[PDB]
Subunit: 59 residues, 6 copies
């Protein structure tokens, strides 16, 4: 199982690392899959590459 | 934030429901983000659509 | 440019053709790209493969 | 409904905001979905990251 | 390294298996990565989920 | 057919060109599609955006 995470810019290296850990553990546990098999991809983007109801996340 | 999960077929609806809850609570805690803005997408595929070291997961 | 569209099941083939046409015009106009080079991909999923703040869209 | 847009580097922030607004409109209108529930993701790449018949776009 | 392949429905089981193999091989060679670490996902869609210049591929 | 490739940063432009080449020939030959209709997208990311068994690639 592979997870691709789309997050807006601005997180520390530490938060991103925690995010990889905790999301992998949630998948392993929910899917009944060995943790070593899980892959996690973070896809970061600037705040104005994210649109909400027709408006840029940066508003 | 948004998560896209690529999983192989075979999980029950209630198993998929756990998966959505638990990955979402993972993202909300890691990022310090509101759980209500988390979106999760499940991309499910046949076992032979997943390749591992050059070989179908279906061996 | 390419658009990948993540939509829930339930729409007819002609509502999906309208969707391809209107997003394609939207991209060509905004980006000033020839309409002929725009590619659109529709990634359709069950309602329960879509989680909204920890809950499947189906609910 | 969510749209992920793959575009080549080079546009201004005002062109990206227009793309977000118009693509969100087209999706709301084509799918009969509330405009406020539409999410758009822009995934921008360098020209040499896009290949056409085996060659980079940048050629 | 991971590859997500978006192909239109209809290819045989043997063709998809070949596709996975040959793609995996191409990534391992070019990137100088062990073939065992390569992961390949196939995302298959109906011919009318593919839009070329504002029109369904199916036409 | 379209390929989206997820690779870690650090390859030269010439390596990325080889990668595009070689992947496109494997798809065209596996699927016997016309090589010039093959599209490739490279999505490159930092080493700490890539998680393996719960840990950043960058360790």
């Amino acid at each position: 199982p592979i997870a691709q995470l789309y997050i807006i810019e601005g997180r520390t290296d530490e938060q991103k690392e925690t995010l990889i850990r905790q999301v992998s553990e949630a998948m392993a546990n929910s899917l009944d899959a060995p943790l070593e098999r899980v892959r996690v991809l973070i896809t970061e983007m600037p705040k104005n590459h994210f649109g909400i109801g027709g408006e840029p996340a940066s508003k």
